[PDB]
Symmetry: D2
């Protein structure tokens, strides 16, 4: 029989044991199928279902686990069922089964559960961001481009700006699930079942939306796994953007936020020194999940039809990612929920370097003033403000007039950060009303997606 | 000004000139918007419009292109506009314009076209496959698992098994477009526009489905780029599967297909021999597109909000991925179309190695025979046949009965590759009727997607 | 204190426990250093040493392992140490120790062992290849480009062609180790130790070649791990090449090899139908390891100095890769060793399709006749042989002359695959003497690569 | 003929034209091979030499370039040669040449040059770092882990901490070149040349260190390309780290550095803003190069021997990488050299959060005082320093005596950041003497990588 190297190489129980409940459900469905085929009398159907539920309980509480001699979870569960109903009844269940459609189907079921757990996590992070946004709706911070100060924005607008990529990720999940909800059961080894089963029925009972249109493809294609891997990589990356922001904020130089004791690691001697370990692990993790994606794609590359053992490599890179997300998403959520914001710091740094010059110029542009004329007028205002070591609002009215008769005192409406953010009242702008509408639109969108994912 | 090294590093006119018609369209739309706001008189409206159509046609014909002094396509285009309507008169157009929402928007506008050219290529490959499948309604080949001869299948079933993944990728394109169809115009540099412009209308006239919900996210996020890159990599990978099958089939050892001279390379000295260079390039390319995706996701990783110069790296990997596909998709479509299938060779190899043994077992299985007994029976039948050196079919009833009385001569209905494939009449099975329904369905689905991508 | 999500996220005991022996070695050396600096009396050195040997032994036998409350291997190991020598003696070991240089050093040592193991495996595969190359010294197979029959080559030449890249990988291992052999001990957190210890001595005691030249870099940089990941991915890729060849050869259509039962999966109904599962797992895992490399590099990207928690992500990918190879390398080595070569099939296919014509053309070119002519001569020979149907060697001398006045009777020598492959008598050629010399050379090179790894 | 699609797909003249000079040197070597074979007339021979010189000058001036009908650089160059010496003197050079060793050899040579250009760039960046380090010998900044202030370090130490990885990369370059210096000339298409040439001689005249040992492997392997790709990716990542440091430093919040006008950029938002574009483009391009590496490895995966057209995809990613680095390395080197460090700001932030208390504890540990005792003492010291809002230095002698009698006034020695950094005198430590010695060692070692890369 098999050599030691081969046995050790092919063994998959350690990661694939998570497929057991799904394999059991599959065995139940196949039990009913065999009943409808005439290959199972009633006596036999009850025997098998009883054995499967007993095995299900024993798998749940932990009484049944894989042996070293077990190659995978399926061999393990057939072994257990045989141990519970004997070989004669047990062997009755193996009629009309193939492994190639089974591994694909089970991977799909598991994946459709996992993607929804991850979806829950994403909604947690979004919820934390939205809650902090609502808790701090008026705090103004310097908006950053090239990590340099641009226009002042509401803190809420920034946080929600981290919320939207995740909503997009949820959209990706919803879209992915539709391609995932296709049952390969009935495809046999590759050529299709000869048992005369009804693939639509089998598909319906196991929670799939439809049966596959092509057995060969149903058993050979793993693009659903690749798509999942991608979506998870994308979620990881967005999380890494948020993470980067929090890490930068947490620095003593920035001091935009102060970390919670429960949601960070602290120093033994330096009493108030806290490290953003959660954010950094998220950041570092994103690379990991990107790697899982690229690796999976490399594995699927140049695959001749139909099934090859290569495809057994589909699960572990996906699995891992999910695991990481299942660790990362709630953590980050808490990390976002626990943030304390130094709003005076942010309001101090928001109008620095005469940022608001921009707004001045823009105002002039709104007033029909030529664009260049407006901008050198702004430059003049800045030069005439660093004249007194003074703000732009503080500038004498004469100067507004001495630079341009177009500069009515009305401009002051945008020479303060409050007025600056209030002036941008277009859809998606950092204006209070717009940010509020955006926030509730986020609420409704989240509700729509979560509603869209129920089964 | 800028040092030579910086200028060399920042130059992008060698790849981004393909955005020119989109920048021009955006400039016309912004002319409308600015006029709507009253910041422009009619003479100017069509002054700028005339200048922009002049520039447009001179960009199409080739008269106007980037100079070495030009940094990007935008600087080039406004240099031209300035040359065509005056130096500051052209500077009027800058009113209410930022670069950050612009680069995102233009990338999107380019991408929604690129993805549809790619979609046309994919549909061409699907078309070729479907046609070869139809032109061989009865051709039977060995089904492959581990590149070993499994159950016999229709060649049509194989080719269509290469058609469905591409259909799924088309589905992915369709889904992606909904997220790509969001305009970031009005998002300014970071915070919203303060000009009182309507992002909705601007979105409508530029061909977008909606405007962005958050300015910061709209100018910072590049996940649509990552999604596009992924979809391209997926298409490339499925193409690599098709390519692998073709490279294997083209070997003298396989001889499943004979390549066309036009679509392959060969030696003058020995004319019969041909090399599947297109499939090989597809295979090698898939890795390159995978790499584009991976690299892009690494680039988007750990980006602090909002816009950073890092994001300029969003274009080139996607561009490449499109470029390559725009080369590979028709090429492949030619290859598949020009393939001559040696039907009798595949028909000959189909029942080899006593493959049909499996079918025998299955027949027994639906007669109500235990799974292991029905399989050893098959082993016995195969062993008896091997000594005789004859096919399983050319076996007298008395041996069928000496192996098992359950083996009535009826069993022979599935000992013929024709009866073998005929027996698998389940949905997505390789039975001629089911395959026919599948092919018609592939036509209807491809047509439906094609319809779904029109604007 | 720390939340459940943070504790769960931070927990690393499931993969990092393999660092325990190395940490205990580190604590040993550190104990010695501590004494000779004057920080420990000798009863305390005895105590600490004894505690560390006890803890080492119980870690080895398995009686001591990590609890669920243990965050990492270090927390566990000093938990055990404190349980074995008390908090006052154990707490005095912490003198002049920090996490950041420690973790880097431990990873380095572990990696220096792991790479060697992998090296042993690679040498095993190389050995199997050389063995088969010796066992088949005269077997001629058709050489493949584009998976198409090019010039005939010795089977030995092909197998050794698979041997050389692995030798290059071993070279990469030798080169890698030198950068790996740099102790970061004495670097502290980042600024260096203030205990007045000698980092070079500590380095020598733990098997390093030198101490780091910069503490900050020593604790921050993980380029050695990325390099390891690359060497592993390269090994995996070469293995995937070999694997591809074996998978194609094992196909019934090719029939170049027959698989061993103990080193493949097959059926018992169809006894001589065997699947090359090992090669396939190698193929997919190659993609996996590529993924690990790309991901790790993505994780190291945009890392601000010095140490970040991001770097904790350096181990799991690398680890994984090593694990994979440690399963793959013997398996492959077994597979190659177990292969049966159908020399008659390969030999029969070698001169097919007038392959040998190219050799004849080369011979004509050597005389010095025009290259176009010789080719001119050769195509002519091909069809004069085609219509008659005789092999190029079955053409009467007079016949050879009518199509070229240069074709002498002797030219027949390169018309047999033996003489043709012998004709290529140039270094690296497929001539028997040459392949023999390169085999001997492979032996010498392999056994020299081996020594440079012994410490 | 070849179809349009195939010709479009096969075209490589847009990227491979850089190989032309190498192709000419190769044609020269080949002319020598032919001369030695006596297949050429010495009059013919120098006819060919003159022709190839002419072609060389014609590539130099630019008068000769590729046409749209030319598929690759080799076709173009032989077309040119034919146009310069006639079709039958030029037709005679074709003798004994195949492209499969040609392309690999040319790629190898080009790579041996490109790797040295990159090398010079890296050395420039290192030199800039050393320059800045020497320019600031006593500057003290807050050491960072988790982007949080830890132990104070010299600015020079940080910059050099960025210098060392690049030195390692130069070492990787040195190691790589030795595997790159293996000539595949004489390997023919696959089985080796039959011309009776001396591969060693060709290898000598073309600048290689040795000739290949196996023709098949010499033509099929591309692991040199993969390794080059890796080295370039690694360099890009270290550069990404430096870049991240600078981007963060350039923030108004940090204010560690101020950017130079010629090595920085001005937003289109405000003119008084200077963004660090060079660093950001380095940061993203790092991801790009990672993508090139991963993609290349994916392409090389599952490649059956020998040459496949897949391998044509070896060049473009590698090329890309080189190009990117050739833009990045000087730029960065300028960026670093142009940096103005706000040393007083950093010095002000250095002793913050009572970080020096760490040092305090460490001092005690060095006195003979055990660990926990020392940290108890440090904690208490922080608690007093803390009540009056005073530094640990400010506290009077009596309070220190009270915390622990081991706190002789000698302790202040490390309560100043200067004495803090001066306590760390071990190799790699932030002690000025040690940092100086490190700098000198860096100088000579860099001069050693530069010596090693000169031929």
């Amino acid at each position: 029989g098999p050599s030691d190297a081969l046995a050790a190489l092919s063994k998959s129980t350690h990661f694939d044991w998570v497929l057991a409940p799904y394999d059991l459900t599959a065995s139940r469905a196949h039990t009913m199928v065999l009943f409808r085929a005439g290959l199972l009398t009633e006596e036999q159907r009850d025997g098998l279902l009883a054995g499967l539920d007993s095995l299900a309980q024993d798998v749940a509480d932990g009484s049944f686990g894989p042996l070293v001699t077990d190659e995978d979870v399926h061999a393990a569960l057939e072994r257990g069922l045989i141990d519970r109903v004997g070989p004669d009844l047990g062997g009755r269940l193996r009629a009309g089964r193939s492994r190639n459609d089974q591994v694909a189907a089970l991977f799909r079921m598991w994946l459709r559960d996992a993607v929804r757990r991850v979806a829950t996590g994403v909604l947690d992070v979004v919820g934390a961001l939205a809650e902090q946004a609502a808790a701090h709706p008026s705090a103004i911070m310097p908006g950053k481009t090239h990590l340099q100060s641009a226009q002042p924005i509401l803190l809420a607008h920034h946080l929600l700006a981290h919320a939207h990529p995740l909503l997009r990720d949820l959209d990706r999940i919803v879209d992915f699930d539709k391609r995932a909800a296709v049952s390969p059961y009935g495809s046999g080894a590759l050529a299709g079942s000869s048992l005369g089963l009804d693939p639509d029925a089998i598909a319906a009972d196991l929670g799939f939306s439809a049966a596959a249109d092509n057995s060969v493809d149903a058993t050979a294609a793993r693009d659903f796994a690749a798509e999942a891997a991608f979506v998870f990589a994308m979620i990881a990356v967005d999380l890494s953007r948020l993470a980067e922001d929090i890490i930068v904020w947490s620095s003593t130089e920035f001091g935009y936020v102060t970390l919670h004791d429960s949601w960070s690691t602290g120093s033994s001697i330096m009493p108030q020194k806290k490290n953003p370990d959660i954010a950094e692990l998220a950041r570092g993790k994103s690379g990991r999940l990107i790697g899982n994606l690229a690796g999976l794609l490399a594995t699927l590359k140049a695959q001749p039809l139909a099934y090859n053992r290569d495809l057994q490599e589909d699960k572990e890179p996906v699995f891992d990612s999910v695991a990481q997300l299942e660790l990362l998403l709630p953590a980050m959520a808490g990390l976002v929920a626990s943030l304390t914001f130094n709003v005076q710091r942010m309001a101090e740094l928001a109008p620095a370097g005469y940022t608001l010059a921009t707004d001045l110029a823009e105002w002039l542009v709104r007033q029909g003033v030529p664009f260049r004329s407006a901008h050198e007028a702004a430059g003049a205002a800045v030069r005439a403000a660093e004249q007194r070591g003074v703000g732009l609002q503080e500038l004498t009215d004469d100067e507004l007039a001495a630079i341009s008769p177009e500069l009515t005192p009305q401009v002051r409406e945008v020479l303060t950060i409050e007025g600056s953010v209030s002036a941008r009242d277009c859809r998606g702008g950092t204006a209070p009303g717009r940010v509020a509408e955006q926030l509730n639109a986020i609420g409704e969108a989240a509700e729509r997606l979560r509603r869209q994912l129920v089964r």
